[model samples]
Target: TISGVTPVAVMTKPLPCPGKCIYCPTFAATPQSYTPESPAVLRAKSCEYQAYKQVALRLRIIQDMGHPTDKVELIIMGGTFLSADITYQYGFIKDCYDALNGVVAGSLEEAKTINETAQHRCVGLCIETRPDICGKAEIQRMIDFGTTRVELGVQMLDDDIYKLVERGHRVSDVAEATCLLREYGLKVHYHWMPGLPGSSPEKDLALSRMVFEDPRFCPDGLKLYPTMVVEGTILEQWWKEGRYTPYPNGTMTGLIADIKALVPPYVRISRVKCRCIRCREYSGEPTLRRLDYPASGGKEIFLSFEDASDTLYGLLRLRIPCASLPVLGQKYGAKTGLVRELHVYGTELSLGHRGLGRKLLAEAECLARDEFGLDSLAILSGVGAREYYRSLGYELVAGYMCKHLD
Candidate 1:
């Protein structure tokens, strides 16, 4: 067996959407809010979005390619899974676990126990949906779904902007979702869109502080989508009417680079800016790469000082909240830093494919040594995809997947 854990992402088929957000594409198939060429659609093509189709195949494929299959981090995404019938929801998750168990789940209880300690142990489970749908029962349901992480579609928390986009939810929905998820010890991640109908690049820059600075909504991870004027999206019509425009020249890039610089090391940034949230390693979980690098920076400058373990300085202290300026977090690193996780998300691609995953991770390696003076680099990878790191010359070390720069 190999070391560390790998994430297995499975996308469900389209379900009825709770939101009719205006900027969304008109694709009637797949998830309501996604593009066809999106990685989820591409990896999942010609397959059912089920446990057997996604998990078993990934397991066998990874095994064939030479890696451990015993450890996995499962991420399940579709539209609003909560909106589907409860029976289907329960069955869907059970089936996912069953695939890992290599058996049929006679019931939820059996699958639950198998999940607790199966050979193909599920280290973590993440479910993505709208923040507006969250509630006491809903949060409890996600727990029953075996989810340790919940990603919310919180495009923006400003009510006017929220309404302008027809997201049909308010700041209260996001705030309530965050408080509930955090209270239950579940990690919260957010998706922030900088270019929406009523938002400006400048407005977007000043906006997310409302998340980190305000105790109400500090996300665990984030995904930044600046605006893409794709065909079939209402935004395309808006552009036709001169009612909307993409970020002017460098506005999107500059703002995100600035935000990344402003992000504190406690945050686990993923996308161009901050796609960070708080995280705690679980029993079957993969430990941290367990090293620290710099974030030290001036207000105008992005890079600053080093990092922390699981806690995000702003939103994730459990009983404790951020107390002052240093704790307030957010110090962006302008182009010259390395992110350890380096997660190339969406459906799993082949190892050493030289696709986005390889290219992206390779970019991180260059920064780690060239800019940061790191002698080597480490990455925490899901088992099935270990070959990608191996393809780049990383080997298993102390349970972490790593590559040496020297």
Candidate 2:
């Protein structure tokens, strides 16, 4: 009764951008969105797309369901594709498509055929790029890679607001890019951001309405993201100085609902909110907390703060084994079974000079001994942090090290 191979969605690694927008949060930093690392370095360290892996696993499920026996659809998502070096971009896409075809070792063409042949049908392939970089050369590159669609970060149409936010592209550039992409027969989607500085709900709604009115500008799909201020970003400094304020959750939701109502039946609303809770918190709105509501149909529900925190803690523990090491009891010996490494590095806790290592060490020690019943602790203290660890009751236990949990 079922079909053939399953569909796969692959999330490509982040690409660095040149614009230094004021509202950007520091924690949003990643090699893909920044340039602290070279493209080669980024690629080496990048994780394989989890979506593709899951789809491959789901192939087994499809087989069990008695579906067809062919291929799968693979989708890739990331920031500013054109910003990446051309070779790396092509290579990355080739590898992803190759992996899906079960010909991880073959040439690009061979891999493509395998991927194409295995699927009952190929739905389409997609990626995201900024409008400024969507030129003829970029389109050619995308076409060569067999990309069927592109999503542009057309956050706003106002020239003043776009410049203020350092979007690095002009409204005219967005129009031109969309036209060029359409000429190439590529489906285009636009990503819009609400609550950007210098934009009010009324202005944002008006812009959305304008987008729908223009056939060339309106996207096949839209992704609405509310602006958020991250720590260490210019936007955060503005918030601290009382120069900027993000919209409240009610305002953001109401605005989106208004936009949603305006979307034509032909256009789809792909996403309503940023999926990251940490980012939502940084945005100064707790709209995602609604995710806790029963109506929200969250994956898990809890009634108390303790229950919620416990759930979060459990999740953290599962992801980072070191987080729960302290609660393991003293069975592992060395004083406490809890995590034993608590190294503090410095004393100065100012703008860039602040020392948080010591505080984290102390917390680790307390959690280990008091909560998990462990005693011994150890930390690899660098030369600069030797004194800080010592101050936290850690004694020199080994090479450039200290132990305190004991």
Candidate 3:
């Protein structure tokens, strides 16, 4: 609830994976690289990997814990989801949406339409896949499924290490996939493995710098999973034969800390802080901060409220997409400004009180109207939040909550 959204990670059924990476574990009836005892895997197994039940149950549990269930960040995780059959892919996504909508639709398109006004609205969707599997056709499919983020398995940047680890794709593929994903207005997160074979700590640190410094690979987020010896894999054989060695316990920690020091503010590494928008500590002393960057052939303005130490209280993503942006609908043309995301972090506010979320939204409205001189502003709000926007003088128009600047 830190970001005003609940993340529901639903796993896909175990299927044949294309990659034969040496470090990955292979457990019977479990997804590759995932342990059966893991919490997500256990929950998935309990439901027999049924997407509808998984989502429904996860929502109920979160609500029972007193967490908000209105905005859901749906993450479809498993091994190379794009490699699965297209029919299964669509059906799986539809099932998840149906659970949220609380009624089954005749088709995938109908399910998506129903979700636009459902009780539990999907604010965003994320899919994990290999770089080689995220080509144009795959990305198009992702867009059709309402995917807003892609998690690429970019373990390392070195081609030599890739071959040594049997990671079928090359470093070039990672860069290309990243560029493609962003061009389609999708956020890109990389899965970075630091302590792989054929790479030293020094090399890993240097390449970590390259990931952000190089213009071609400025990913939006990252998950650092340093390599380790796991049973029933090629890595275990190498460890037994003394051909492979794990890094000294403290060395990787220091390396990870150093890597963190190099991360840019735009990247979200991990962790959830401040369960709702107005924690007592951040009641009134937050300074408005703005960060501007380029993405997907458009300009993005990230507005936030933070204290002097950069403790984020709230944030909003205001996008000015290019004239030829691929987003559907007649309402989004040259002059339309898009607010892709808006979040207020902290505990939920008491009933009938102004919150920081309203302040951030007002800031976006001002920026889009005065600075950019846009004709009107549109927000991709969750269905549960549509009435909230309506109260603020916005109305549902062309699949978005829109307000014309006076």
Best by TM-score: 3
Q: TM-score for candidate 3, please give it.
A: 0.79
Q: How close is every model to the real structure, measured as TM-score?
A: 0.64, 0.54, 0.79
**1-406 per-residue lDDT for model 1 (tens digits):** 1255566777776664455656663432222243556654566665766656777777777788787766677777653677777988888788788888887768876775655456777656788777677887887777666566777877777776732233357788888777666545456677777777788777787886556666566565566656567787666788899988778758778877766655543455555234333232211322223222211111111111113433221111111111111111122112122122333222332234224445455545555567555545444333334555667677754323545564
lDDT of 3 at 253: 82
Q: lDDT, candidate 2, residue 243?
A: 80
> Which parts of model 1 have CA positions greater than 4 angstroms off?
19-32, 61-68, 162-167, 272-406
Please list the residue runs of candidate 3 whose C-alpha ends up more than 4 Å from where it truly belongs after superposition: 1-4, 17-36, 60-68, 163-167, 271-284, 294-300, 319-323, 327-331, 335-340, 346-355, 358-406
Q: Please rank every candidate by lDDT, starting with the best.
A: 3, 1, 2
Clashing pairs in 3: 275-346, 276-345, 276-346, 276-347, 277-346
**Candidate 2 regions off by >4 Å?**
1-73, 119-122, 162-167, 230-234, 272-406
- The sequence of per-residue lDDT tens digits that candidate 3 reaches over residues 1-406 is 2436678988888776456555653521222342435667689879998999999899888989998776788888874677788999999999999998899999987887777667677877888787788888898888778776788877788787842223457878987887676555566788787778778999999998888777668777777776777787667788899888989879988887787778766666752132222221243478888888775456778787888666677677777766534444565445777776665664322111247778887888898889888877776554445566777888765345777776
Q: What is each predicted model's overall lDDT from 0 to 1? A: 0.56, 0.49, 0.72
TM-score of 2: 0.54
User: Could you report the Cα RMSD, in angstroms, for every candidate shown?
Assistant: 13.3, 23.5, 4.9
